[PDB]
Write a protein that binds this ligand. Structure first.
Ligand code: HEM
Ligand code: HEM
Ligand code: XFM
Ligand code: XFM
Ligand code: H4B
Ligand code: H4B
Ligand code: ZN
Ligand code: ZN
Lengths: 405, 404
């Protein structure tokens, strides 16, 4: 029938067709012979120009002024800037529309119903590492908002031909130290071993606990990274307790409130923003399931299971399933007590379904990656598990970029 | 050309070379991934090469590639197809192909078992009656008093100049679904269509929540025929919880034997439209989907209420707590009953070993991440952290349209 992908919700028996995917200009890793859908990492003037033109059209289209003479003048202006410099600049409003669109387009983000509510800080005037720190602090302050979390993004100056990038070396703005121990093991977050060591190499005196908030290594073009300690009263944290299990608080576990991804590259109409930290609010499973329970992270399942006096000798006692659920409950209860925005995976996925319906009307489709959308506990208990999804790459986009060291 | 395949828990890396043996196209293009689609919307010369390829695979397996016997058999197949437009499999080749199609099923977390499969040759069959006898012997052997054994029974291939042998039921054991006055369903709502078919063709029905359906079996170009399974043939496991006494008051049971009967078996271009197969259950299938899905037995909320859980808000995780307990009732019960079952932790661990065995034997293993990762506690198992390449290899199992 309709010459477009047919997508079905198996739980409601409803069907849709994706026409959005025709607007895709960049290929992913699948072919007709094999799907590489599960791999984490995918893989001059002419090229830039056509990306810019395309972006400008999305912009003018979004303000229902497509085919306008303001529209036309703008296209000319951009293509003049490039023929003489090899690049162009985005006006304020265009940058705001581009960063919202790059979020909206992110296939692995379950939080997109919020896409329209993003507070965009233009730091394209920033010119030093000390100044990057001020912008980042102001970002944390506004985003945190004493627990009532607000989505934000700070956009530092774009990449320029033959000139080093603005970079944030840290993968998030708040990260716990991971200290590799004499005896082979790790204290704190095993995921941050590399970055912790970088900080020490750069003259940070490390602490010694499981939840030591790392300083920031920030880099201005062609200069060495400089080191900044976030003032702890800016870094809001939540000590973890359980609603009925009294001993849980005695575990001494905590998590920070603000999820601020700082390593991704932001692409708008062919322009490339190497430094553009963004934050929203956590889904409980990210903390309660991945950060605390992954075997290669804090790995606490067994310690919790032993406090719950479960039989850890056999898989079939479902000790891992029971301990995980209770860890996730703790996380939710602890944020709600502390009055810090957080969302549970049932609510999140429910809102994602509603987002899917909005986007069908608005654009004809929604690029979505099933394996990242579906939560890491209770998958089939969430409506997104039963929903077929089409994955494809739209621009503007967040991308992974190489570590700058 | 040979994709890199990383495990993110342990950082180990492998390369998949087997993918190049794929001859069938999936749903994906460079433009868009369509790997999450459940089903696809996706002349005698297409056959000859498919048969040649298969006869090669088989001789390769018995280390006689290039023998007199292999070249001899090759020509014989080429002859039979040039004379008749079809051909026949030697039994030991059928045995090999049926295992190979299990081996190649990308969606199956149970493939470490692939080598142990009892194949019944049921190609001497000319009636539904004979179909039924074979099915009863299958079930008996497979169930083996609770100590389950994987098996497949293969019925005669499709022929161009006639209708197929078919088993109408999608599984050999199914719980009836009755349409009630108020529009509600007594029993299992997934089997309403087939319940009504059984009735329409003569069956006098029951009115419990777990009535075992009769079989509708079909020989070529003939009305289907009704066959009641003798109760003692169908091993059932009553459901109870180890610590929660009221669970048993729910009156739940599940059957011991998962026996899929609606799939088409493809071997060297030959098609066996009736070839039912059974293994044993992973506990999540019963404890999560069959009991917890709202379109099925939909017991989640009942169970949570009895757990005394706050059912008003998502954030209490009542759904998550109840499912775990239900899944646990399933394991406990099968273990109490002494019936073979595997939990999702043990199953996904055996699968990780499968991948390693297949890497060494064949240079990879096609796998469907979304189906291999279980439907609860996904990241808790090791397959979650494992990258996977998906592609269609032959021999294969595939879907076919319902015969009505
Ligand atoms: C406000 C609440 C938000 C929630 C609840 C949320 C949730 C999530 C989750 C759970 C993931 C996958 C996480 C993982 O497993 O690593 C994700 C991915 C992602 N999020 Fe959102 N997010 C939110 C806000 C934002 C914002 C403001 C942005 C950017 C403006 C954003 C951009 C992205 C991107 C680009 C990815 C994909 C990462 C990748 O490609 O690997 N998110 N989100
Ligand atoms: C012996 C223990 C076995 C276990 C634990 C097992 C487990 C599973 C599971 C959990 C699925 C997912 C399907 C679903 O969630 O609905 C599956 C799919 C599948 N199984 Fe296995 N299985 C076993 C034996 C077998 C046998 C004996 C065969 C045939 C010889 C087989 C063939 C398949 C095929 C072809 C699929 C894919 C179904 C599809 O395309 O949707 N399995 N299996
Ligand atoms: C805003 C926001 C909201 C929220 N609730 N959670 C997060 C953290 C999860 C996340 C969201 C987006 C991007 C990344 C990390 C990007 C990344 C980069 C590389 C190089 N490898 C990866 N595996 C991941 N992580 C961010
Ligand atoms: C052997 C076996 C072992 C085991 N542990 N679980 C099962 C049940 C799950 C399963 C395994 C293989 C094939 C199918 C049938 C899938 C299907 C397809 C279509 C198109 N409609 C359906 N109703 C069902 N189901 C079977
Ligand atoms: C191998 C697999 O693709 C990889 O581990 C993915 C699976 N799904 C995920 N989903 C989310 N949200 N986050 C993740 O880190 C992952 N990991
Ligand atoms: C739409 C979605 O892909 C679909 O419901 C799949 C997802 N993964 C699954 N995985 C298993 N094991 N069984 C299933 O039925 C499904 N359903
Ligand atoms: Zn794909
Ligand atoms: Zn359903």
């Amino acid at each position: 029938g309709p010459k477009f992908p047919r997508v079905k919700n198996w739980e409601l028996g409803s069907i849709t067709y994706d026409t959005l995917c025709a607007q895709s200009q960049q290929d992913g890793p699948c072919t007709p012979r094999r799907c590489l859908g599960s791999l984490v990492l995918p893989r001059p003037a002419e090229q830039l120009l056509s990306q810019a033109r395309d972006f400008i059209n999305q912009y003018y289209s979004s303000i229902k002024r497509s085919g306008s003479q303001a529209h036309e003048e703008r296209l000319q202006e951009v293509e003049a800037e490039v023929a003489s410099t090899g690049t162009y600049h985005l006006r304020e409003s265009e940058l705001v529309f581009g960063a919202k669109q790059a979020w909206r387009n992110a296939p692995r983000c379950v939080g997109r119903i919020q896409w329209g509510k993003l507070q965009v800080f233009d730091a394209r005037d920033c010119s030093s590492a000390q100044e990057m720190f001020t912008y980042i602090c102001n970002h944390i302050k506004y985003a945190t908002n004493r627990g009532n979390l607000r989505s934000a993004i700070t956009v530092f100056p774009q990449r320029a031909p033959g000139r080093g990038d603005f970079r944030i070396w840290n993968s998030q703005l708040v990260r716990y130290a991971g200290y590799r121990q004499q005896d082979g093991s790790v204290r704190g977050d095993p995921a941050n071993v590399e970055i912790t060591e970088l900080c020490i190499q750069h003259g940070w005196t490390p602490g010694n606990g499981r939840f030591d908030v790392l300083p920031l290594l920030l880099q201005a073009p062609d200069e060495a990274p400089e080191l900044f300690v976030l003032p702890p009263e800016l870094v809001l944290e939540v000590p973890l307790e359980h609603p009925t299990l009294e001993w849980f608080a005695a575990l001494g576990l905590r998590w920070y409130a603000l999820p601020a991804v700082s390593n991704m590259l932001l692409e708008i109409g062919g322009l490339e923003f190497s430094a553009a930290p963004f934050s929203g609010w956590y889904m409980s499973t990210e903390i309660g399931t991945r950060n605390l329970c992954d075997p290669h992270r804090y790995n606490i399942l067994e310690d919790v299971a032993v406090c719950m006096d479960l039989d850890t000798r056999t898989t079939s006692s479902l000790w891992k399933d029971k301990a995980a659920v209770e860890i996730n409950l703790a996380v939710l209860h602890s944020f709600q007590l502390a009055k810090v925005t957080i969302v549970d995976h049932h609510a999140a996925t429910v809102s994602f379904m509603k987002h899917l319906d909005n986007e069908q009307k608005a654009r004809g489709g929604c690029p979505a990656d099933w394996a990242w959308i579906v939560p890491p506990i209770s998958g089939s208990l969430t409506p997104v598990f039963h929903q077929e999804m089409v994955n494809y790459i739209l621009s503007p986009a967040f991308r992974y970029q190489p570590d700058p060291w």
